[PDB]
Structure 1
Amino acid sequence: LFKSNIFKLQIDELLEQVKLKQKHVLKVEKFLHKLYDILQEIPDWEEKSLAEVDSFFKNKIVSVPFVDPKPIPQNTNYKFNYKKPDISLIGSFALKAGIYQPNGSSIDTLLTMPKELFEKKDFLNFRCLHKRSVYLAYLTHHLLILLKKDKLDSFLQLEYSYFDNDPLLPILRISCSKDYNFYKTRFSINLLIGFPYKVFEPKKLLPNRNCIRILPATPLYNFSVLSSSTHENYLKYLYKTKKQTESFVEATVLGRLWLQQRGFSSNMSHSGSLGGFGTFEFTILMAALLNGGGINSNKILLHGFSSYQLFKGVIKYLATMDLCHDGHLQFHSNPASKYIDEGFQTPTLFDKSTKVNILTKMTVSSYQILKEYAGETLRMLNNVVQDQFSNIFLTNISRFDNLKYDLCYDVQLPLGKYNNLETSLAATFGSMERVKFITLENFLAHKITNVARYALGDRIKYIQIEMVGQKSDFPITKRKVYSNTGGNHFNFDFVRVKLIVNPSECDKLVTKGPAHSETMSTEAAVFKNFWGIKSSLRRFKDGSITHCCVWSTSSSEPIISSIVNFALQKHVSKKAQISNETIKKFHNFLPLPNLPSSAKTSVLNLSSFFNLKKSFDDLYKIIFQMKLPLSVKSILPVGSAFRYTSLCQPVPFAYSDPDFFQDVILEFETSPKWPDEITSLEKAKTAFLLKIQEELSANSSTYRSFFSRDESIPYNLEIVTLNILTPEGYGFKFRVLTERDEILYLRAIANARNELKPELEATFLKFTAKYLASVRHTRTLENISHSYQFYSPVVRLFKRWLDTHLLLGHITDELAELIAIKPFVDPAPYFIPGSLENGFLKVLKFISQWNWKDDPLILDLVKPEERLTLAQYKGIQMNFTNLRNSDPNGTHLQFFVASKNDPSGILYSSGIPLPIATRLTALAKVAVNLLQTHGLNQQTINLLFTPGLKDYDFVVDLRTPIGLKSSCGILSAPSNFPENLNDLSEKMDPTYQLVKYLNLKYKNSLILSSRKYIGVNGGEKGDKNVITGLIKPLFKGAHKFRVNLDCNVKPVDDENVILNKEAIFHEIAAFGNDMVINFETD
């Protein structure tokens, strides 16, 4: 009851957001009274032939919008005239479904044609359609004479158009430009002309029957023929269906809200776009759902139900009851709906009384694409925790082609004129091919979608071939939509191929096919022709035999990036060039790992990372069964290489990368004899690792040994990290753990006073995220990436886009990886993340509108259908509202990143300064705004890795002694270590510890941020960096006489002290005197 009532308050208020006033409909219907009066004086002329029609209109202003093919005098026997038609109302304003929209809409003022003006043979040879193209220009010829005489044409204009973006019915449009003034309502009047109800035979105008006899089945040509008669009877159904349901219009408004979010409307989809089923068909489906819906005409939706029940059930019927390849929908307007379990390889919504397909407007490419969003939106009505009203319609899903899809390429279609298509394309395009798909915009639209269907197949989730630059408008003094754009004579500039790829098959090299035999089978005939020399005989691993094709792997593009150029080369256009230059340079921003087949390694190739997990498992294999005084029970690494969170891919013998040694947290048996002192705690566990080193030194000469202290724990200086590098070249930093670590931390908090309790708590969080909650996040890090491996391709590069802009020095990699993993578990309203370009652009838009004060981060570590419950996630909401009492603007608690394991929100994002977080969002605001304004290009694509380092009182440019890019395992290498292992650190990043002391001493007056990965972020040499630093706001004013100001300040008077920048610039300069190259002082 809370899933409906909280939705109903989100439905009733949202319908009030788009509340159309009665003032806007007043002058719009009163202008129709000036339209109905002026049309009532439109007289009928005399009947004339086809030849006399072109004689009267060639010297007149009005011209006939004749569709292809135009009429010819050698085949024209009948006559043509104009008549006084019966105008009526249809659509949204006839069912009271209209609402306020800023972009505007069309008011479907229907004009029914006279029945006596059409012959019995009107349905064939385009006879009645030749009457409608002549009478619509004739009615525009009479009304423009009438509207000029009423002097309204100063702000009113007339032009040509088409109904529902279908070119088979010429129509005129009336609007208002900037008593009868409807320019304040912004409603356009579509002067639609329809034929009389079954004036031709509806049984002869079914889908399987043809009306171009010169036959093959014309499902789309009969769709424009038969549905021209159903404008009155089907509207009479939804007129009475509005009276039987209290929330028919309210749920169709939310149906109009949900369908407009993903690009679905009454625009046609066979012409190379997405659509064909929108507000018109959903209100028709709501009439079929409120009049039955079962397989034996049982009920699917209720009549007395509200908007919360009718909106969710219809789209779930659009998701769970198939209509494309498995079944079909039935309807009857003249008696229940009963779903037919046989499909026709397309969308087919059967009108049994009217014999026309109500789902004929959508093609096979646009039918299944809405169903993947339908099951996504119906699952949002099934969730019992999250609010899903804003996730449906108030979040625009149709903004960018790189957002809702995985990849979109610009394949220019320089096809030229229609008669030159014998040499332009490989296809034979004649009159019989142009019988049902007569418009040339539709003919290559499904052909290239089918040619890509053998190319990709199951490598994507859908197919969308988009016609970019194609409009629907024309002048009434012109013939149709003609253009000289793109060097061609088509109804588009070019075409773009868009698809959402599934990562488990999008980069497969072995293009699978059917089995071989003694004779070439019919299933093997098509695949052999489609590949040719690319098709060869290749056997399986278990002994099976089939015809298959091997592809080429690359580190900049997937396997389908060649096949989108391959399958478009053969059967689409020999001169068309398809290329995806956005995701090509995006993969070049990642680190190129020094391994074999590095340029031949796709983004899905994670074999190099798991091969480093083999050596550490071989390293732990000598550790686990070894006898010590204390036996081992836990041998696990919490490093970034085993969690796929390292910015550098794990290459052997790589000493220069900061993520070289994958961190290890190990545990011994339960022991009360551990000492209860902090210095004695790490003194004892290092002794058990000393004998474990003495077991590794005795009979394990393949692996090396060295010791180092980990100073990442504040106030703990007794800890020791065991560094063991194996014979292959992979090293691990081994640290022990027991039950005394959190014992010494919590006893340090309660015993200490109210003064020093905070810093020993944050240093306890340093012992929590590294020892207590280290393996807990490391278990779910490798686990849930098995549902979307593109998170491991993105979050390694999203930090690489963050490390280039001087952000790595203040935030940990876990909170950076959980930021890019928010569009994986909660990808709404977009699709599943499946590429590095899709993953980075999802993080670019989500971190832009990430207001850290009002909404915190609670991302479920759950695989595809382990998450926190409704009572548990509301407890995570309790951490936000109580912390915002003393930290309301995000100055003391900004990034609340929480999950099921750590609902405190401040695990990896506590102790960080707020001002770097303000630029972390500002670099997410300006980078995403540049994509929609200036477009997406490689000038802007590498610009996100280009920081200007402005707003800086300090900017230090430096250069190190040894360039260490090749030493870190980055192929622009690492083969062996030295004889003594102490000399291996001479090729490390010297600015890592040089900036580590920078934030250490001068924390109270300087804000030190720098790069920790200098090998990839140095350019060519792999040793260059830059540090941006800002002064504090409290030390920007004069501070009085005190001892503990902790600021490197000078004398300004006998009473005040101020931080003089002269010694402040030299203090970081005299430390890094060997690295002293340049320093900017303002």
Structure 2
Amino acid sequence: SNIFKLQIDELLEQVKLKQKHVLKVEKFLHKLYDILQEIPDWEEKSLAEVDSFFKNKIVSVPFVDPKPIPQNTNYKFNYKKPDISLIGSFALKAGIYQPNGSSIDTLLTMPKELFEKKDFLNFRCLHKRSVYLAYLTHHLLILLKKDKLDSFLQLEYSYFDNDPLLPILRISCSKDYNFYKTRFSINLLIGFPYKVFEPKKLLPNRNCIRILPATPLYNFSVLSSSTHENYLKYLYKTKKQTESFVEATVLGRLWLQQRGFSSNMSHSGSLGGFGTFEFTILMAALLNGGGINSNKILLHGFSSYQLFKGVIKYLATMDLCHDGHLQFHSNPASKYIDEGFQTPTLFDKSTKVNILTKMTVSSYQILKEYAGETLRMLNNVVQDQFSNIFLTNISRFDNLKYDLCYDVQLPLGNNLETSLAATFGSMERVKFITLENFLAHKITNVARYALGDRIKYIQIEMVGQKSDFPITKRKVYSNTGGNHFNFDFVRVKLIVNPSECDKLVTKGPAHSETMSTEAAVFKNFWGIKSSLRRFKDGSITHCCVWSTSSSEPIISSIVNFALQKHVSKKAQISNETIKKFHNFLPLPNLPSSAKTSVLNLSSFFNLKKSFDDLYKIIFQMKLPLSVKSILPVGSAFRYTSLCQPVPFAYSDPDFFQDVILEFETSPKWPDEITSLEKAKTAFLLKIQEELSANSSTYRSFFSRDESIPYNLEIVTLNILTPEGYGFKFRVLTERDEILYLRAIANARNELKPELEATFLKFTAKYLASVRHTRTLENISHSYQFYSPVVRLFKRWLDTHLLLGHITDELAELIAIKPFVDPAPYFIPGSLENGFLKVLKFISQWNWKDDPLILDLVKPESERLTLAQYKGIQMNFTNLRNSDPNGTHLQFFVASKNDPSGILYSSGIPLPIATRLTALAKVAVNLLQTHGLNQQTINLLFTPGLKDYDFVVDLRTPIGLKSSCGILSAPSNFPENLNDLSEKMDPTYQLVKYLNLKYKNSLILSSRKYIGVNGGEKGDKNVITGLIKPLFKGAHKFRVNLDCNVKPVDDENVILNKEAIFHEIAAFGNDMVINFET
């Protein structure tokens, strides 16, 4: 906890506003107040007279829709000197430095004589306020010219917190009084006196627009405008009692901003309605109670951290919207009431103002989710989470913040079509003041009802909405809107539920003799798509049935049908980014493949079934030693194979799945390493012999293994199942491990590091591989999208020629990080969302100074403890002491299975490690500069190939795409198993042996999966090379150059590139076609 407190103080001072600028602005608006009193008074006017007064002036009155017509505007208009005062964060001295800039809220209370008791009705107070503002802007403007301030002041109208009913005047300074360097803007809020209108008439249930429906949004604007200084005194009072108020405020402000929360209206569509003001009022209210027993939740002695944690815990746990609400008195213990008003409510009995009216239900749920996720981070003890809670901005990309985003182009966009506009009407104009508020609620309700349990949270954004307009205009002008609708288009952003997003059937109400109300709404909503169906259990229910596709999710269809039916038949809904990511996953050549969802693992289960059949056969065999266990370890057994298993598709590099065969303990094993392996092979020979006899439908053959260095006697048994799958069997013996340790001990002290590398590759394959597949298979069921993303990430690594050096396990462990450590984001719920979160992590990973250590567990045991965590931290620091620059080891990936951290990330050349980091950084920048769209995604998956020194083109004799099991094909294995080679791609083996030979001078890379990345026929591959910087120049001749060189002088030699090309060319024989250097 002590570490946290020092971290806060570093953050507080870093964002602290420089005191010089506070004086610089305070020198200005102290002079600005003088100008306001210079403004003369005015006489009563009718709308005809004020219209004439402003007819020729550049200023125009910002009348709020509906603008007053001559018939209904019978009341008169007047101006009088206000009561200038300062409110907001600046009054409370709780602001911070913001590079984008801050605002100083200056309040001008209209004198009470200007208002009648019944002016809270029919926009009467609003239209008087507007002419008051316009008249002030007129005389204020000329006085600026008189004082020669107009040179560097820019004046514009704006809506206070995006509230269409409350236009204001903003004074901004362009490049002595010039406060441009302060990065401030002064807001001129025209408020009403306190308690002018009876607050009981302004309650949310009451009405104030005559057409009867309630008008909560209208009531809030008028009532809250009369309550500004009142809440300044309330916060000013609490600021004294508790000494950590301001520190707790900025922590809340910094919390909110990174989440993209504002104090603006959410009803127009934006995410907001809860800002620093609302957070401060909630904190202050809890300091005077807050429990169901009205007991205090916060104490005036709490520190900055404890005040912040108390408010967050309140938001996370106590429900303020559906079942429960909190009431307090600003002028009386605050009490939590169980009855809820189905909308966020923080009621104020003293002022009758609901502080959370600007807060929608949809964004309140996201806030309750964000608060609950940091409370978990805030209760965390093993890891430090200060950066995630405060120093990480998650609102930069919506795609990283939301699983699926749909753009809805509404028709006829210089006004919306008649049918769409007609739906607005007068009844809703009373409830939803503006058309955008009405569609934001309409899009939300139809999209929420249609999707239902398929999503968790929904946001509707009005893209391209403006809130500031010139002083010469009355309302905001949008290019597409033309003063009719202030937006370009709608974006529907969703947080999906992976467990049940891709259901084939949308269940509805159960059948009954008399159609219930629920069943009536279900059928009216869905129309022809609805149906009555019966299921195996015998229930009868109303439901509608959709069709899965491999290219898009079900939710894309549901939203499109529901929006066109209920919003407008001419609407265009399109999400093409998700469709590309789906098409980048290879499409298997299985029955009904194109109709299969990307969350379907049936192909993986079918292979597991054929293994179980082979599993039974081996156990019933009679051998000299009983079979202890048969453990499958291949990629397909953890659902990570890039290409889904297909029967008889033996061109796939992942066709033969590795299986560890283990016998009972014996003391008769040979005590030499080579004899032990030949003892193992004798067991495989008997298995093949008896399997060939009893089970003739199975075919088998023997292959050599050279993965483990210097152990040249390993032989594996390859079994070809009649179902059409391949399995590779290797024997594991208890004597294996201790003979390798014996070799290390007996080695010369110079050779010991070389032998330890052999032991490392032995344990990565035989010992750790079993633990890895076990854990990764189990958790993947809890992370439904982990398998499609890790496959697509491996597809991405292969396009850029990085899989040849990155082991598959390292790719899987990097790809799981967004799932097991999702903070500050949510767990990925889309193939697009998950993939880009992986690229974002690699982009920002400083692997030289930070380790990656994973808690491979299902979501809230095998959690890492503080003792184990520090132990792994110590392993990183010790490793970096000897290798500070990261030349030997770049990626430190550790977990319970691998506490050492070097098991899967050893042996990667540095240029490949930085190439992975370089490409991820370039990919993220490309997304920032150009949004995610059709063109950028193609760039993500097309390789450079110009950065390498030379590139070699290869073509296989036959296209391997069909035999690899990819749908743009064999149906049995060859009669001669030597014929299997004729349909393989050897270029991966060529690069491997070349890298061993030219390790000192060259780095060669290629594509492992030729059928996926080899074009239409899957026959084109490329070998890209890299000359190390040393041998690129000339060197003096010496015996230990260990490079293929040509003479230039008697004691000078240079790399013989042409000779190398002939050697690379003569490997592939016919395969090599072309060279580019």
Bin for the TM-score computed over the shorter chain: over 0.9
TM-score normalized with structure 2 length:
0.98
| Preserved contact between residue 455 and residue 564 of structure 1 (Cα < 8 Å) | yes
**Do the aligned partners of residues 488 and 424 (structure 1) sit closer, same or farther apart at CA in structure 2, a change above 3 Å counting?**
farther
1:870 aligns to 2:866 (yes or no): yes
**Do the aligned partners of residues 140 and 879 (structure 1) sit closer, same or farther apart at CA in structure 2, a change above 3 Å counting?**
same
SS of residue matched to 2:651:
coil
SS of residue matched to 1:566:
helix
| Preserved contact between residue 466 and residue 478 of structure 2 (Cα < 8 Å) | no
> Aligned-pair distance for 1:1040?
4.1
* 1: CA distance, partners of 2:770 / 2:45: 87
> Aligned-pair distance for 1:93?
0.9
**Do the aligned partners of residues 306 and 609 (structure 1) sit closer, same or farther apart at CA in structure 2, a change above 3 Å counting?**
same
Deviations 1:32-90 (A, max 9, x none): 11111111111211011222221211222221111111111212221110010001111
| Preserved contact between residue 28 and residue 185 of structure 1 (Cα < 8 Å) | yes
Pick from 752, 755, 761: which aligns with 2:756? 761
| Preserved contact between residue 111 and residue 192 of structure 1 (Cα < 8 Å) | yes
2:881 maps to which residue? 885
> Aligned-pair distance for 1:574?
1.9
> Aligned-pair distance for 1:799?
0.8
> Aligned-pair distance for 1:462?
0.5
> Aligned-pair distance for 1:721?
0.7
* 1: CA distance, partners of 2:802 / 2:424: 58
* 2: CA distance, partners of 1:1004 / 1:60: 80
SS of residue matched to 2:574:
coil
| Preserved contact between residue 262 and residue 396 of structure 1 (Cα < 8 Å) | yes
Q: Which runs of 5+ in 2 are unaligned?
A: none
| Preserved contact between residue 205 and residue 214 of structure 2 (Cα < 8 Å) | yes
* 2: CA distance, partners of 1:426 / 1:172: 30
* 2: CA distance, partners of 1:486 / 1:1034: 63
* 2: CA distance, partners of 1:393 / 1:595: 48
Deviations 1:206-235 (A, max 9, x none): 011100123111111111121111101111
SS of residue matched to 1:1015:
helix
> Which of 317-326 and 974-983 deviates more?
974-983
* 1: CA distance, partners of 2:568 / 2:55: 37
**Do the aligned partners of residues 420 and 935 (structure 1) sit closer, same or farther apart at CA in structure 2, a change above 3 Å counting?**
closer
> Aligned-pair distance for 1:910?
0.6
> Aligned-pair distance for 1:362?
0.9
> Aligned-pair distance for 1:1052?
3.4
SS of residue matched to 1:61:
coil
* 2: CA distance, partners of 1:422 / 1:1073: 67
> Aligned-pair distance for 1:1051?
2.8
| Preserved contact between residue 413 and residue 488 of structure 1 (Cα < 8 Å) | no
| Preserved contact between residue 315 and residue 378 of structure 1 (Cα < 8 Å) | yes
| Preserved contact between residue 217 and residue 433 of structure 2 (Cα < 8 Å) | no
* 1: CA distance, partners of 2:911 / 2:700: 42
* 2: CA distance, partners of 1:708 / 1:599: 36
Deviations 1:149-172 (A, max 9, x none): 111011112111111111112211
**Do the aligned partners of residues 380 and 49 (structure 1) sit closer, same or farther apart at CA in structure 2, a change above 3 Å counting?**
same
> Which of 789-798 and 429-438 deviates more?
429-438
SS of residue matched to 1:816:
helix
Pick from 400, 418, 423: which aligns with 2:397? 400
* 2: CA distance, partners of 1:155 / 1:787: 59
* 1: CA distance, partners of 2:14 / 2:964: 56
> Aligned-pair distance for 1:973?
2.2
**Do the aligned partners of residues 144 and 427 (structure 1) sit closer, same or farther apart at CA in structure 2, a change above 3 Å counting?**
closer
> Aligned-pair distance for 1:906?
1.1
Deviations 1:661-704 (A, max 9, x none): 11111211111211111111111122222222233122212221
Matched residue count = 1076
Percent of residue pairs identical: 100
**Do the aligned partners of residues 912 and 483 (structure 1) sit closer, same or farther apart at CA in structure 2, a change above 3 Å counting?**
closer
* 1: CA distance, partners of 2:633 / 2:588: 22
> Which of 665-674 and 793-802 deviates more?
665-674
| Preserved contact between residue 107 and residue 189 of structure 2 (Cα < 8 Å) | yes
**Do the aligned partners of residues 817 and 486 (structure 1) sit closer, same or farther apart at CA in structure 2, a change above 3 Å counting?**
farther
1:561 aligns to 2:556 (yes or no): yes
1:204 maps to which residue? 201
* 1: CA distance, partners of 2:870 / 2:620: 45
**Do the aligned partners of residues 802 and 182 (structure 1) sit closer, same or farther apart at CA in structure 2, a change above 3 Å counting?**
same
SS of residue matched to 2:347:
strand
> Aligned-pair distance for 1:421?
5.8
| Preserved contact between residue 158 and residue 167 of structure 2 (Cα < 8 Å) | yes
> Aligned-pair distance for 1:974?
3.3
* 1: CA distance, partners of 2:411 / 2:105: 36
Alignment of 1:568-607 (within 5 A): 568-607=563-602
* 1: CA distance, partners of 2:484 / 2:959: 56
> Aligned-pair distance for 1:420?
7.2
* 1: CA distance, partners of 2:225 / 2:98: 28
Deviations 1:299-321 (A, max 9, x none): 11121111110111101111101
Pick from 138, 141, 148: which aligns with 2:138? 141
> Aligned-pair distance for 1:823?
0.9
| Preserved contact between residue 415 and residue 489 of structure 1 (Cα < 8 Å) | no
SS of residue matched to 1:14:
helix
2:441 maps to which residue? 446
> Aligned-pair distance for 1:486?
6.3
| Preserved contact between residue 655 and residue 985 of structure 1 (Cα < 8 Å) | no
| Preserved contact between residue 426 and residue 570 of structure 1 (Cα < 8 Å) | no
| Preserved contact between residue 422 and residue 428 of structure 1 (Cα < 8 Å) | no
**Do the aligned partners of residues 755 and 282 (structure 1) sit closer, same or farther apart at CA in structure 2, a change above 3 Å counting?**
same
Deviations 1:759-814 (A, max 9, x none): 22112111111101110111111111122121111011101011011111111100
* 1: CA distance, partners of 2:763 / 2:1055: 36
2:538 maps to which residue? 543
* 1: CA distance, partners of 2:415 / 2:704: 76
**Do the aligned partners of residues 1072 and 648 (structure 1) sit closer, same or farther apart at CA in structure 2, a change above 3 Å counting?**
same
Greater percentage in helix: 2
> Aligned-pair distance for 1:615?
0.8
> Aligned-pair distance for 1:426?
8.7
| Preserved contact between residue 701 and residue 718 of structure 2 (Cα < 8 Å) | yes
2:21 maps to which residue? 24
> Aligned-pair distance for 1:287?
0.4
| Preserved contact between residue 248 and residue 308 of structure 2 (Cα < 8 Å) | yes
Deviations 1:394-438 (A, max 9, x none): 11100112110011122112355xx97674329732212110211
> Aligned-pair distance for 1:393?
2.2
SS of residue matched to 1:774:
helix
| Preserved contact between residue 412 and residue 486 of structure 1 (Cα < 8 Å) | no
| Preserved contact between residue 197 and residue 229 of structure 1 (Cα < 8 Å) | yes
* 1: CA distance, partners of 2:192 / 2:421: 39
> Which of 1064-1073 and 318-327 deviates more?
1064-1073
> Aligned-pair distance for 1:1038?
4.2
1:79 maps to which residue? 76
| Preserved contact between residue 294 and residue 338 of structure 1 (Cα < 8 Å) | yes
1:43 aligns to 2:40 (yes or no): yes
* 2: CA distance, partners of 1:102 / 1:779: 49
> Which of 369-378 and 1065-1074 deviates more?
1065-1074
> Aligned-pair distance for 1:190?
0.4
* 2: CA distance, partners of 1:266 / 1:474: 20
* 1: CA distance, partners of 2:416 / 2:710: 78
SS of residue matched to 1:184:
helix
SS of residue matched to 1:80:
coil
Q: Which runs of 5+ in 1 are unaligned?
A: none
> Which of 162-171 and 483-492 deviates more?
483-492
1:981 aligns to 2:977 (yes or no): yes
> Aligned-pair distance for 1:1031?
1.4
> Which of 390-399 and 175-184 deviates more?
175-184
1:940 aligns to 2:961 (yes or no): no
| Preserved contact between residue 652 and residue 965 of structure 2 (Cα < 8 Å) | yes
> Which of 344-353 and 980-989 deviates more?
980-989
**Do the aligned partners of residues 426 and 620 (structure 1) sit closer, same or farther apart at CA in structure 2, a change above 3 Å counting?**
farther
| Preserved contact between residue 700 and residue 720 of structure 2 (Cα < 8 Å) | yes
* 2: CA distance, partners of 1:621 / 1:96: 76
| Preserved contact between residue 604 and residue 645 of structure 2 (Cα < 8 Å) | yes
Deviations 1:586-644 (A, max 9, x none): 11111111101111011111111111111111111111233211011211111000111
* 1: CA distance, partners of 2:314 / 2:412: 41
Deviations 1:537-569 (A, max 9, x none): 122332221111111211111000111211111
* 2: CA distance, partners of 1:439 / 1:414: 18
Deviations 1:904-934 (A, max 9, x none): 1111111121111111111111111111102
| Preserved contact between residue 486 and residue 494 of structure 1 (Cα < 8 Å) | no
> Which of 620-629 and 151-160 deviates more?
620-629
| Preserved contact between residue 211 and residue 430 of structure 2 (Cα < 8 Å) | no
SS of residue matched to 2:896:
coil
| Preserved contact between residue 415 and residue 424 of structure 1 (Cα < 8 Å) | no
